Amino acid sequence: EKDKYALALKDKGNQFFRNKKYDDAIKYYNWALELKEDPVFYSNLSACYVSVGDLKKVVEMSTKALELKPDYSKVLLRRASANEGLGKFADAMFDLSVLSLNGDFNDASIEPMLERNLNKQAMSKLKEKNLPSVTSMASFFGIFKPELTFANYDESNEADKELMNGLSNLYKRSPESYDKADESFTKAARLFEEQLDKNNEDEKLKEKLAISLEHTGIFKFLKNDPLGAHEDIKKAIELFPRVNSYIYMALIMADRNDSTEYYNYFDKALKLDSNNSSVYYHRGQMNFILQNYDQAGKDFDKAKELDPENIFPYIQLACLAYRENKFDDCETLFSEAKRKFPEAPEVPNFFAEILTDKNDFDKALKQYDLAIELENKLDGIYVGIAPLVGKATLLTRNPTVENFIEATNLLEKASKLDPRSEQAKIGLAQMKLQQEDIDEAITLFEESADLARTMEEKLQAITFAEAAKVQQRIRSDPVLAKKIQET
Amino acid sequence: EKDKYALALKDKGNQFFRNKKYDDAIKYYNWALELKEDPVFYSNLSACYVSVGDLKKVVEMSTKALELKPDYSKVLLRRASANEGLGKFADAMFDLSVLSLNGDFNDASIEPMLERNLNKQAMSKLKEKNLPSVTSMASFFGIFKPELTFANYDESNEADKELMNGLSNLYKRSPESYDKADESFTKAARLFEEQLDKNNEDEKLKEKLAISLEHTGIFKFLKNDPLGAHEDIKKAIELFPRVNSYIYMALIMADRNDSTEYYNYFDKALKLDSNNSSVYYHRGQMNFILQNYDQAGKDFDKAKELDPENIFPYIQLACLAYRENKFDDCETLFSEAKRKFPEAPEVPNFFAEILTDKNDFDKALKQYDLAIELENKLDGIYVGIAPLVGKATLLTRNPTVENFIEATNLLEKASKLDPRSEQAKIGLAQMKLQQEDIDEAITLFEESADLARTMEEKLQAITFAEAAKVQQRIRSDPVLAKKIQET
């Protein structure tokens, strides 16, 4: 009569589950398994682990369950979703594909799930191969020492003033500050460029128009093609070197094709500022992307020495060891910088995304919130929308009647502070699409498209949009639409 | 009562159909529709039109059948594959979706169909918002009058020999001839540079290097990325102008973003050989793309006068009217040229690509065979694999036991000749895919990725390959594979 208390335990557990006291139920299920190895006990296990957010467990218990009872859609579909959470798209489609056959589920219910997974899978494999978000600008210019001077500063000259305006709006974080710097920089370029013809052989004018263009091209780089970005900073070098010019040049080239010439541009830069710690940081990134995980973290040390205050030289090395499966050196190295600059939102935010990767959902979730705190705690901008979107991500990673609102809440906000952020836009479109608001979902995807940086990301957005449009066309007239409602 | 006859007419009609007498069957099926307007009649009547490759009709007889029996899975299915045949993917997906609801089709065999149509669609909307392939390059240069000799040729100098050997291979059509040209122009450019460095003011070395760089340049604008092409042909224009270089500039420039200069480049060219044909032909291209359907034509006629022997000026205007709805004009215009250069494969191939756009799979199918003919009645290369894949497409444009074997061959050959042409590759992949040849299809796809020009197509080829991968893994352990066989 063990089944008596086998059944008894289950039920008693079902309650410890009912009142959200999940941690409790699990036990009663684990011990009820001692009496009888009934699949339902595993199904119930995987079920609660979901509410807890433990996906690797959900995928285990779910398997054990199926292993004793193949015909178990309620479970298989759960593993299909749990797999998607762990980012295991291939398995996600396998479970779904096996599901589309066996049980008679099918219908426009699981079809979209496959599409989404296939999508993420393709986009992922592919990766082994107007101005962008404000939160990116900030992370891009954060490695440089903020300029605010520039010699022979102004006169009652409008050009010299525009330069100051933009050069001021460049740094100083704050929203719109970046867009402001852009327009003023370009204008400063128009003027000087004009004044230069009145003094074709002027020194102070070239230097001014030099730094003026040195910035116009960088924003162009951040904008469309490196076409203009080149001629601009190139002419800038011709007018007057300037460290940043070379560094920027070394990117517009490393951008495409190959020419180990830029690894010499840094050198051309050092020719001026032999200790311009920003250079050693970038040379570290290039060597870091060149799979050269050594010389990379070698330059960084020089970046940290020639400027300990700069947080990035730490963040890079921090978990660089992660791309070297040295989670040990990482987890602690991040901590070193996690308390050395106990006010910097970066560490919390980045270390967070890395914990999310290594699948430490329980921790990476806390880290983001920490970043979100230290973030708005300062009137700057550092790690802007990043945390909000980054958080909603690992959340949606586990769809929940509740959890989904938390995310859609975060994304909605995020997409308001940084409208130029597609990462946020698609997020919502994805959300509103699951919320049967296909109509709303479409508009978002469509817009997400416009915001997307490259064609691949654009092709991604349109597919959904299109898949949604066909869904929208089907959900017309109750004659067919109502038929879909039966769920 | 009279159904006795309708049945007879049908039965008798079913006989003519069973005897490949398709145009014969439709007759009795059509008279049967005079007595009794039965669904099975429209159905069968549509089954004919399919074998007769009359897609438009298929959608028709297929719809009216549904309008009398909405739960006609077979017909619905057919109309879906019919629509996709006419490039109407949206509808194709709509039909397939309903077939998932309405029809009790529990299978999952609709999924891959939706994802194909979806994919095709997604790319179609996205579009409206290593050297290339031999057959492609062969067309690009096809507008320039051969250049076999340059001034002050050789003294012994290797550079001069190289430049010549280069120009030689440039034209001469034939595959591999290009790979060598590219390889020579770069070598010729090098040498002539080392030499021009010995004598800055030698106008002979300048000219040589100019035409040397110019050619290396345009090739770079094909191996992809104007960054390197622009600088090369730019220096070629600073050393010694040269009409042909200005044209390439306006092209590398028109590629990037707006430029009130890439228009002035043509005029600069003109200042050299005002009565040059190519120039006006390209200026007509820009005006043609700039929707400037107006001036787009004036520039061609003026380009046709300066070289009536050139086919291209004709082929363009030949349908610059099509883009201007005026079809008939494009017809006589294609005729006018078809019989003024009745040996050129171009006219026939560029007519076929058009006839197909208008859904004239009939005259277009022939127009291909025609071009495929005149093509072989030559030794050069001219219209390369275009005709093959061309008819291979319009062929699979209606999946038939016969159709999928005709095109499949055409592609096998198409790839044999032009191993670069990505189209040929995916074509097979698509075939191998349906041919129930998964692993092979996956390979062809994976390969199609490596050859795809832009990440745009890259992600596409990977999508399929990935879908295929999951499909394969499923068709394993027959406790799952068997069920898949019950189609």
3-state DSSP of chain A: CHHHHHHHHHHHHHHHHHCCCHHHHHHHHHHHHHHCCCHHHHHHHHHHHHHHCCHHHHHHHHHHHHHHCCCCHHHHHHHHHHHHHCCCHHHHHHHHHHHHHCCCCCHHHCHHHHHHHHHHHHHHHHCCCCCCCHHHHHHHHCCCCCCCCCCCCCCCCHHHHHHHHHHHHHCCCCCCHHHHHHHHHHHHHHHHHHHCCCCCCCHHHHHHHHHHHHHHHHHHHHCCCHHHHHHHHHHHHHHCCCHHHHHHHHHHHHCCCCCCCHHHHHHHHHCCCCCCCHHHHHHHHHHHHCCCCCHHHHHHHHHHHCCCCCCHHHHHHHHHCCCCCCHHHHHHHHHHHHHHCCCCCHHHHHHHHHHHHCCCHHHHHHHHHHHHHHHHCCCCCCCCCHHHHHHHHHHHCCCCCCHHHHHHHHHHHHHHHCCCCHHHHHHHHHHHHHCCCHHHHHHHHHHHHHHCCCHHHHHHHHHHHHHHHHHHHHCCCHHHHHHHHCC
What is the residue type of B273?
Answer: D
Contacts of A467 in chain B (CB under 8 A): 93, 118
Record the tokens describing residue A318, joined without a space.
């921090």
Positive or negative torsion for Cα A187, A188, A190, A191: positive
Measured CA to CA, the distance from residue B167 to residue A26 in angstroms comes to 78
Q: How many angstroms from the chain centroid is the CA of residue B127? A: 14
Of residues A106, A111, A480, nearest to B106 (C-beta): A106
Whole-angstrom Cα distance, residue A36 to residue A42? 11
| Integer CA distances (angstroms), A273 to A278, B276, B314, in order | 10, 53, 61
Which residues on B lie below 8 Å from A88 (Cβ)?
Answer: none
| Alpha-carbon distances of A321 from A143, A282, A327, B394, rounded to whole Å | 21, 18, 7, 54
DSSP-based three-state secondary structure for B195 = helix
Which residues of A are less than 8 Å from B257 in CB distance?
224-225, 227-228
Mutate to test the interface with A, among B67, B123, B125, B460 (most CBs of A within 10 A): B125
What does residue B121 show for φ and ψ, rounded to 5 degrees?
-55, -65
Count of Cβ atoms closer than 10 Å to residue B370 Cβ: 19
* Structural contact between residues B28 and B13, judged by C-beta atoms closer than 8 angstroms: yes
Quote the CA–CA distance of A175 and B404 in Å, as a whole number.
Answer: 58
Q: Which residues in chain B are contacts of A228 at CB distance < 8 A? A: 256-257
What is the chain A residue with the closest CA to B473?
A94
Residue of B nearest to A485 (CA): B101
Cβ pair B466:A94 closer than 8 A:
no
Contact residues, chain A, for B98 at CB < 8 Å? 474, 480
Amino acid at the residue A420: R
> Measured in Å, how far apart are chain A's first and last C-alpha atoms?
39
Judge: B100–A122 Cβ closer than 8 Å, yes or no.
no
Considering only CB atoms, B108 lies closest to which of A97, A454, A455, namely: A97
Torsion of CA A464, A466, A468, A469, to 10 degrees: 160
Residue of chain B whose Cα is closest to the Cα of A93: B470
Cβ-based contacts of A484 with chain B (< 8 Å) = 101
- Taking the CA of residue B330 and the nearest CA in chain A, the distance in Å comes to 33
Question: Burial of A62 by CB count in 10 Å (0-12 exposed, 13-18 middle, 19+ buried)?
Answer: buried
Q: Which residue is it, tokens 């070629």?
A: B236
Task: Please indicate whether, in this complex, the C-beta atoms of B228 and A257 are within 8 angstroms of each other.
Answer: yes
Q: Are A266 and A282 in contact (CB under 8 A)?
A: yes
Chain length of chain A: 487
How far apart CA A222 and CA A131 sit, in angstroms, is: 6
Q: Are B414 and B406 in contact (CB under 8 A)?
A: no
C-beta separation of A465 from A449 below 8 A: yes
Tell me if domain A1-127 and domain A128-487 are identical in fold.
yes
- Identity at A339, one-letter amino acid code: R
- Report how far residue B462's alpha carbon sits from residue B449's, in angstroms, rounded to the nearest whole number: 6
Half-sphere exposure of B263 (CA within 13 A, CB side): 7
Q: Which of B448, B382, B458 is nearest to B137 (CA)?
A: B382
Burial class (CB in 10 A: 0-12, 13-18, 19+), A70: middle
CA B397 – CA B87 distance, rounded (Å): 9
Domain residue spans of chain B: 1-127, 128-487
Q: What span, in angstroms and rounded, lies between the C-alpha atoms of A193 and B187?
A: 39
Structure tokens at A487: 């769920």
Q: Would you call A455 and B114 a contact, using CB atoms and an 8 Å cutoff?
A: no
Identify whether the C-beta of residue B93 lies closer than 8 Å to the C-beta of residue A470.
yes
Two tokens at B381? 């290369």
How far apart (Å, rounded) are the C-alpha atoms in residues A207 and A193?
A: 11
Q: Report how far residue B422's alpha carbon sits from residue B411's, in angstroms, rounded to the nearest whole number.
A: 11
CA separation for the pair B151, B143 (Å, rounded)? 22
Per the CB < 8 A criterion, the answer to whether B192 and B208 are in contact is yes
Distance between CA atoms of residues B351 and B284, nearest Å: 19
The closest of A180, A177, A184, A208 to A194, measured between CA atoms, is: A208
Sign of the CA dihedral with A357 first, then A362, A364, and A368 last:
positive
- DSSP notation for B258-320: --SSTTHHHHHHHHHHTT-HHHHHHHHHHHHHTT-HHHHHHHHHHHHHT-TT-HHHHHHHHHH
Task: Return the residue matching tokens 């949606």.
Answer: A396
C-alpha A276/C-alpha B344 separation (Å) is 64
Question: Cα separation of A152 and A193, whole Å?
Answer: 17
CA angle A362, A364, A366 (to 5 degrees): 75
Which region, left, alpha or beta, applies to residue A307 given φ > 0 means left and ψ of -120 to 50 means alpha?
A: left
Q: State how far the Cα of B115 lies from the Cα of A460, in Å rounded to an integer.
A: 13
Nearest-CA neighbor of A287 among A275, A302, A272, A274? A302
Angle between helices B22-35 and B39-51 (to 10 degrees): 160
Query: Which residues, including other chains, have CB under 8 Å from residue A485's CB and lie 6 or more apart?
Result: none
User: For B453, which DSSP code?
Assistant: S
Q: What torsion do the CA atoms of B162, B168, B173, B175 make, to the nearest 10 degrees?
A: -30
At A414, list the tokens: 């995020």
Torsion of CA B148, B151, B154, B158, to 10 degrees: -70
Cα-based distances in Å from B483 to A93, A100, B108, B136, B474: 18, 11, 11, 45, 11
Chain B contacts of A93, Cβ < 8 Å? 470
HSE value, Cβ hemisphere, 13 Å, CA-based, for A83? 24
- CA dist B462 to A222, A426, B458, Å? 28, 22, 6
**Which two tokens mark A316?**
């890079």
For residue B471, what is the enclosing H or E element?
Answer: helix B455-474
Distance CA B330, CA A411 (A): 53
CA distances, A371 to each of A53, A333, A379, B460 (Å): 21, 17, 14, 37
Among B115, B256, B483, beta carbon nearest to A115: B115
Test the B interface: residue of A76, A83, A89, A463 with most B CBs within 10 Å: A463
Q: Is B116 left (phi over 0), alpha (psi -120 to 50) or beta?
A: alpha
Distance from CA of A482 to the nearest CA of B (A): 11
DSSP symbol at B48 = H
The number of angstroms, rounded, from the C-alpha of B243 to the middle of its chain's C-alpha atoms is 30
Residues 6 or more apart whose CB falls under 8 angstroms from that of B93 comprise A467, A470, B114, B117, B118, B121
The angle subtended at Cα B67 by Cα B61 and Cα B69, nearest 5°, is 100
**Hey, how many other C-beta atoms are within 10 angstroms of the C-beta on B71?**
10
**Cα three-residue angle A43-A107-A120, rounded to 5 degrees:** 75
Alpha-carbon gap, residue A158 to A184, rounded angstroms: 11
- CA triple B438-B440-B445, angle to 5 deg: 90
Resolution (A): 3.0
Give me A108's structure tokens: 């426009």
CA distance B486 to A416: 52
Rounded to a whole number of angstroms, the distance from the CA of A225 to the nearest CA of chain B is: 7
Give the span between the Cα atoms of A181 and A90, in whole angstroms: 45
* Contact state of A227 with B226 under an 8 Å Cβ cutoff: yes
**Where is B218: in which H helix or E strand?**
helix B203-223
Alpha-carbon gap, residue A295 to A287, rounded angstroms: 6
CB of B311 closer than 8 Å to CB of B344: yes
Half-sphere exposure of A6 (CA within 13 A, CB side): 12
Q: If you write DSSP's letter for every residue of B372-433 in order, what string do you get?
A: HHHHHTSSS-SS-SHHHHHHHHHHHTS--TTHHHHHHHHHHHHHHH-SS-HHHHHHHHHHHH
Residues 6+ apart with CB under 8 A from B291: none
Tokens of B342: 């009745």
Chain B residues closer than 8 Å to A463 by CB = 118-119, 122
Contact of A270 with A301, CB cutoff 8 Å: no
- Taking alpha carbons only, the member of A182, A181, A186, A192 closest to residue A159 is A192
Tokens representing A193? 């460029």
Question: CA angle at residue A148 from A143 to A153, to 5 degrees?
Answer: 145
Question: Which residues in chain A have their CB less than 8 angstroms from residue B230's CB?
Answer: 227
Cβ neighbours for B452, distance < 8 A, ≥ 6 positions apart: B422, B458, B460, B461
Q: Which residues of B touch A454 (CB under 8 A)?
A: 455
Angstroms from A216 CA to nearest CA on chain B = 16
Q: d(Cα A378, Cα A373) in Å, to the nearest integer?
A: 9
Tokens 């079902």 sit at which residue? A14
Q: Side-chain half-sphere of A97: how many Cα atoms within 13 Å? A: 26
Mutation pick from B462, B475, B477, B479 vs chain A, by most beta carbons of A within 10 Å, is B462
Q: Structure tokens of B393?
A: 């497409």
Quick count: other Cβ atoms within 10 Å of Cβ A263? 15
Spatial neighbors of B326 by CB under 8 A, at least 6 apart, are none
CB pairs under 8 A between A and B: 130
Report whether A357 contacts A349 (CB < 8 A): no
Q: For residue B337, give the amino acid letter.
A: A
B424 burial type by CB count under 10 A (0-12 exposed, 13-18 middle, 19+ buried): buried
**Helices A327-340, A346-357: crossing angle, 10 deg rounding:** 160
PDB experimental method: X-ray
For A458, the token pair is 């654009």
DSSP character for B142? Answer: G
- What fold is seen in the domain A128-487? 1.25.40
DSSP letters along B324-375, please?
GT-HHHHHHHHHHHHTTSTT-SHHHHHHHHHHHHTT-HHHHHHHHHHHHHHH
Distance CA(A63)–CA(B195), nearest Å, equals 73
Identify the residue whose tokens are 């404000």. A134
**Residue B376: how many other CB atoms lie within 10 Å:** 10
Q: From the CB of residue A37, how many other CB atoms can be counted at a distance below 10 Å?
A: 12
Q: Does domain B1-127 have CATH number 3.10.580.10?
A: no
Q: Residue B434 in contact with residue B405, Cβ under 8 Å? A: no
- Angle between helices A438-451 and A422-434 in degrees, nearest 10: 160
The single-letter DSSP state of residue B200 is T
* DSSP H/E element including B247: helix B243-255
Distance from CA of A470 to the nearest CA of B (A): 6
Q: Cβ contacts (< 8 Å) between A98 and chain B: which residues?
A: 474, 480
Euclidean distance between CA atoms B89 and B103, whole angstroms: 20
* 3-state SS assignment for residue B46: helix
Which run of H or E residues covers position B186? Answer: helix B177-196
Q: Which of A259, A466, A471 to mutate against chain B (most B CBs within 10 Å)?
A: A466
User: Would you state the structure tokens that stand for residue A175, as one six-digit string?
Assistant: 């929203």
